[PDB]
Amino acid sequence: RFLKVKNWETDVVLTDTLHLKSTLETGCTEHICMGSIVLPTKDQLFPLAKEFLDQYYSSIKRFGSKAHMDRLEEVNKEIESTSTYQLKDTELIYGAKHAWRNASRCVGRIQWSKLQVFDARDCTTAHGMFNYICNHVKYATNKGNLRSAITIFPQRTDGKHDFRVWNSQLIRYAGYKQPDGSTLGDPANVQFTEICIQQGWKAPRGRFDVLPLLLQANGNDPELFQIPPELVLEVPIRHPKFDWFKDLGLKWYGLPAVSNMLLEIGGLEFSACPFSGWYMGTEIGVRNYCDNSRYNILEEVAKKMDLDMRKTSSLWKDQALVEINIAVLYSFQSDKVTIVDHHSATESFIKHMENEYRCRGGCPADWVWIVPPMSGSITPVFHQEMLNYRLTPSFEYQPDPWNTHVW
Amino acid sequence: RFLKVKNWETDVVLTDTLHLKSTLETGCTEHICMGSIVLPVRTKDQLFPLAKEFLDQYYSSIKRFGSKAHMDRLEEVNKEIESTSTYQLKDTELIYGAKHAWRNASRCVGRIQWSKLQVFDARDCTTAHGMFNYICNHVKYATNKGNLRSAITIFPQRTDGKHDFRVWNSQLIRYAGYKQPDGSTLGDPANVQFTEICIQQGWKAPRGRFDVLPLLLQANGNDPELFQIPPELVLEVPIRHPKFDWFKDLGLKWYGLPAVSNMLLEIGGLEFSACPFSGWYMGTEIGVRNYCDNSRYNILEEVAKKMDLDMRKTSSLWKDQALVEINIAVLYSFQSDKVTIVDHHSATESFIKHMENEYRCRGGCPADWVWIVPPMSGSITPVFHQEMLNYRLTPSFEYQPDPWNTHVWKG
Numbered sequence: 001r002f003l004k005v006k007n008w009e010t011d012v013v014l015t016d017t018l019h020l021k022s023t024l025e026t027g028c029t030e031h032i033c034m035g036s037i038v039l040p041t042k043d044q045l046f047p048l049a050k051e052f053l054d055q056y057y058s059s060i061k062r063f064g065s066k067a068h069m070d071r072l073e074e075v076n077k078e079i080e081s082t083s084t085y086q087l088k089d090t091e092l093i094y095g096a097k098h099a100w101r102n103a104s105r106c107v108g109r110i111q112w113s114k115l116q117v118f119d120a121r122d123c124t125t126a127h128g129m130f131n132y133i134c135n136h137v138k139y140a141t142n143k144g145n146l147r148s149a150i151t152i153f154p155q156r157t158d159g160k161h162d163f164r165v166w167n168s169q170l171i172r173y174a175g176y177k178q179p180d181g182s183t184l185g186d187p188a189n190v191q192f193t194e195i196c197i198q199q200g201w202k203a204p205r206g207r208f209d210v211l212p213l214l215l216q217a218n219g220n221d222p223e224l225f226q227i228p229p230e231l232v233l234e235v236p237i238r239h240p241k242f243d244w245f246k247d248l249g250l251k252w253y254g255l256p257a258v259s260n261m262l263l264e265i266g267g268l269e270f271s272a273c274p275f276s277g278w279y280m281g282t283e284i285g286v287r288n289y290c291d292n293s294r295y296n297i298l299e300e301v302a303k304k305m306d307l308d309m310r311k312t313s314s315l316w317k318d319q320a321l322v323e324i325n326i327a328v329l330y331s332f333q334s335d336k337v338t339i340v341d342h343h344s345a346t347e348s349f350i351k352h353m354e355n356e357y358r359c360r361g362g363c364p365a366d367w368v369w370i371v372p373p374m375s376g377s378i379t380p381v382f383h384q385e386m387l388n389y390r391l392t393p394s395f396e397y398q399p400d401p402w403n404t405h406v407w
Numbered sequence: 408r409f410l411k412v413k414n415w416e417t418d419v420v421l422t423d424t425l426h427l428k429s430t431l432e433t434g435c436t437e438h439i440c441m442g443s444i445v446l447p448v449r450t451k452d453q454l455f456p457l458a459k460e461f462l463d464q465y466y467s468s469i470k471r472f473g474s475k476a477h478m479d480r481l482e483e484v485n486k487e488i489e490s491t492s493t494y495q496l497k498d499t500e501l502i503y504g505a506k507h508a509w510r511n512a513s514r515c516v517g518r519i520q521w522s523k524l525q526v527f528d529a530r531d532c533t534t535a536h537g538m539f540n541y542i543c544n545h546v547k548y549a550t551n552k553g554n555l556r557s558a559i560t561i562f563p564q565r566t567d568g569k570h571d572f573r574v575w576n577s578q579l580i581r582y583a584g585y586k587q588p589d590g591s592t593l594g595d596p597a598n599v600q601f602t603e604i605c606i607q608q609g610w611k612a613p614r615g616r617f618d619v620l621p622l623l624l625q626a627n628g629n630d631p632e633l634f635q636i637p638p639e640l641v642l643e644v645p646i647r648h649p650k651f652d653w654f655k656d657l658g659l660k661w662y663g664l665p666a667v668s669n670m671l672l673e674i675g676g677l678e679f680s681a682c683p684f685s686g687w688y689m690g691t692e693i694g695v696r697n698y699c700d701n702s703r704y705n706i707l708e709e710v711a712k713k714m715d716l717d718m719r720k721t722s723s724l725w726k727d728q729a730l731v732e733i734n735i736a737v738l739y740s741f742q743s744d745k746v747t748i749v750d751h752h753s754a755t756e757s758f759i760k761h762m763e764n765e766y767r768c769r770g771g772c773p774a775d776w777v778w779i780v781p782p783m784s785g786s787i788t789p790v791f792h793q794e795m796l797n798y799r800l801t802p803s804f805e806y807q808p809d810p811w812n813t814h815v816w817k818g
């Protein structure tokens with residue numbers, strides 16, 4: 001019922017009680033661990049609403065106060081007659097901040113309480129959505145001094161009137177299959193790129209073409225829009241010691257902004273809730289640049305470093321990985337664009353985890369995702385036992401809209 | 408019910424049915440994943456079904472399920488359980504048992520090799536000196552002058568839990584750790600407690616950074632006694648770097664034979680509490696963990712110092728730069744001295760081929776991602792991108808409490 005987590009580098013032991021709150025299911029059983037799987041009515045809504053308002057009023061030190069009870073009845077009455085309900089601004093902000101706080105896969109949660117929340121619940125059209133997104137992008141970008149933000153479109157109703165951003169992130173590079181059999185640009189985005197092409201985008205067909213936004217308001221067919229190029233802060237990638245690195249022609253965007261997740265607060269479902277912070281270096285240098293199924297540049301870089309690629313045991317992939325990552329961090333720093341290295345990020349998360357254990361009685365954490373994709377064991381999170389469980393408010397994955405949406 | 412796992416690099420999707428044979432529990436529930444927690448006298452009653460399951464598996468694999476020899480063996484085991492409270496494994500069942508415990512070890516990346524395991528039957532052993540002799544033979548056989556061979560030696564099973572055979576060392580070969588009065592540690596800080604115990608048992612400690620510990624060996628529930636492994640039996644590799652000539656002056660070395668001696672081997676309900684086993688190293692175990700963990704030799708600072716890296720900001724990735732160089736040095740040193748070692752690229756590619764093979768021929772391969780993914784360069788190894796299902800099959804190796812915590816001292 002109570003559970004201990006040990007850090008095997010420091011011997012520091014923490015006791016978790018927060019897990020006894022969790023309701024949603026992990027995918028694991030007593031018989032099987034699914035820890036490494038990427039994806040494992042009116043009557044439904046009121047317990048959900050109640051459970052959320054209870055944690056809200058307890059957080060503002062007013063649990064069981066008349067103002068608490070009154071709000072419970074007003075929501076109960078609104079559900080009974082409207083089959084849904086509306087969140088107060090204060091509840092919206094709290095819900096969003098807590099969905100981030102509860103994101104067990106996110107290493108950057110030390111920052112959870114400083115999230116700028118933009119309420120776009122009054123939005124009605126895709127042109128409206130575009131305006132809100134551009135304002136979000138400009139606000140978060142802040143000329144390189146990045147700030148966390150989320151923008152929240154109207155909640156689901158009958159599920160036939162969904163707001164969706166079809167893009168997976170607000171800013172991403174296009175992907176084309178070429179006659180060659182090779183891929184130009186980002187292979188992750190090939191399918192979405194074609195969907196933009198069949199919707200009518202003129203594609204420049206380069207390595208680093210910023211995709212257009214494809215915006216669905218109120219269940220209607222989605223619409224193309226190009227983000228003013230002047231709102232998209234990008235960094236050219238160079239190396240502090242290797243002069244040849246510039247000729248690889250590498251660039252990345254400053255703003256990571258996930259736009260395909262669903263935000264659930266008090267049983268209400270916000271299907272379009274783009275949010276953004278800033279990069280940890282490895283996301284770009286390890287995953288985007290080096291995954292065999294992404295830009296996959298390890299082979300090209302190793303060649304320029306004149307390393308022995310004859311045998312895997314020369315650790316040439318590993319040498320090139322480090323240098324690719326040094327260059328990402330150097331480039332973002334030199335251009336004054338916020339970025340965090342994996343040493344700094346994981347050390348912060350350990351500090352945050354200790355805060356959450358003393359202040360909240362726990363911190364749900366998914367070790368498979370929190371440990372960086374390079375140098376795992378020289379980061380302190382490697383040695384940290386973590387407990388993974390699902391709390392609400394939360395961000396969840398949802399089906400790609402094109403599989404779903406009817407034209 | 409069939410369970411699917413997907414490789415996110417290749418889109419290969421595999422179907423697991425083997426998890427259906429899984430008996431033991433994971434630590435996890437529908438409400439909590441304990442996937443990163445390091446650790447989350449049997450009676451006649453419980454013993455017969457365990458013996459029966461095991462023998463059903465054995466007889467299946469040799470294609471004799473339901474045979475008169477299968478039925479006769481069940482009845483003979485049954486009769487022996489009721490009459491004596493335990494039973495004895497045939498040699499063939501012991502071999503099969505030991506190979507399967509390795510096959511089932513979900514935290515082990517080296518399993519492609521599971522079927523080539525030299526089993527030494529030491530169930531006729533009775534004394535600590537007998538144990539020492541069996542262990543020297545294992546070490547010489549396994550070492551094979553650098554062309555390492557996988558092996559396990561199996562001492563007598565638990566009886567009443569008062570007569571246990573235990574190897575008190577956690578590996579057959581490991582270096583002492585000495586905690587100094589100024590709070591520094593000389594040698595391997597992981598072995599401080601055990602070293603203290605050796606010392607108190609009368610070991611005279613050289614007190615260097617690389618003193619090979621003595622063996623502390625318990626037979627038949629008796630008090631353990633000290634033995635020194637003959638030095639000529641302990642193959643060691645001095646560590647140098649192919650390009651950096653100052654690397655050798657760090658004074659590093661490591662032993663070639665990794666030989667886990669503190670686990671419990673369970674087969675058909677029987678408990679083998681001393682069953683040391685050994686293979687060969689994957690380079691990262693030494694280069695990443697043993698050398699670079701902050702709680703271990705911790706040489707990152709001193710290495711990066713000698714590499715003249717920028718150390719005033721973590722964002723120069725100086726730690727990462729030094730880590731790779733150390734790992735290069737380890738592999739180079741082993742290869743140069745013709746001592747078997749495997750790099751993490753090669754080992755993980757092998758594991759993936761093993762795992763796909765196992766799904767096809769066996770209907771699954773239990774695997775613990777937290778453990779299989781190497782402690783450096785995770786995502787450029789194909790395992791990182793592999794979904795895995797973790798569950799407990801028997802035969803199995805299990806953790807057991809350190810014997811100094813449980814042992815009843817006789818005097």
Ligand code: HEM
Pocket residue numbers: 100103105106107108109111115148149150261275276277278279280283340345369395
């Ligand atoms: C501010 C600096 C931040 C950093 C350094 C950061 C870091 C990360 C990283 C490295 C991941 C792993 C994702 C992957 O590898 O694909 C992640 C996941 C995630 N983060 Fe953050 N984060 C930040 C801000 C935010 C904010 C503002 C939110 C929401 C308000 C958020 C919510 C999430 C969620 C929901 C996931 C899981 C995505 C998934 O399951 O695929 N993060 N975070």
Ligand code: HEM
Pocket residue numbers: 505508509512514515516517518520524557558559670684685686687688689692749754778804
């Ligand atoms: C042939 C060469 C082998 C290689 C390269 C190899 C590789 C490894 C590695 C890297 C680990 C993780 C250890 C750690 O980081 O703490 C491990 C764990 C393990 N291996 Fe192997 N292995 C080999 C052979 C064997 C053999 C012969 C056995 C026994 C028959 C064995 C059984 C195990 C077990 C039971 C674990 C789990 C240890 C634990 O939970 O602490 N392996 N293997």
Ligand SMILES: Cc1cc(N)nc(C[C@H]2CNC[C@H]2OCCNCCc2cccc(F)c2)c1
Pocket residue numbers: 038256257258275276277278279280283
């Ligand atoms: C807000 C924020 C800040 C930050 N630094 N980093 C992030 C994660 C972003 C960026 N870097 C990856 C992306 O993570 C979000 C995408 N999650 C992948 C899960 C997935 C499941 C199934 C199929 C797939 F192809 C992918 C968010």
Ligand SMILES: Cc1cc(N)nc(C[C@H]2CNC[C@H]2OCCNCCc2cccc(F)c2)c1
Pocket residue numbers: 008445517665666667684685686687688689692
């Ligand atoms: C047979 C074989 C071959 C090989 N290459 N590698 C191995 C694992 C060895 C080597 N390198 C580490 C050790 O693994 C065995 C010890 N396992 C640690 C688990 C643990 C539990 C509780 C507390 C702890 F601090 C640690 C075995």
Ligand SMILES: C[C@H](O)[C@H](O)[C@H]1CNc2nc(N)[nH]c(=O)c2N1
Pocket residue numbers: 035036037038368369370415791792793794795
């Ligand atoms: C199969 C495995 O679960 C998958 O590759 C995961 C592993 N850990 C991860 N960790 C992070 N931060 N991001 C990812 O995309 C993944 N992928």
Ligand SMILES: C[C@H](O)[C@H](O)[C@H]1CNc2nc(N)[nH]c(=O)c2N1
Pocket residue numbers: 008382383384385386442443444445777778779
């Ligand atoms: C807390 C965490 O599970 C622990 O540090 C584990 C992580 N993965 C590991 N993986 C291997 N192979 N060996 C280890 O010792 C560990 N340590």
Ligand SMILES: [Zn+2]
Pocket residue numbers: 028032033034035435439440441442
């Ligand atoms: Zn689990």
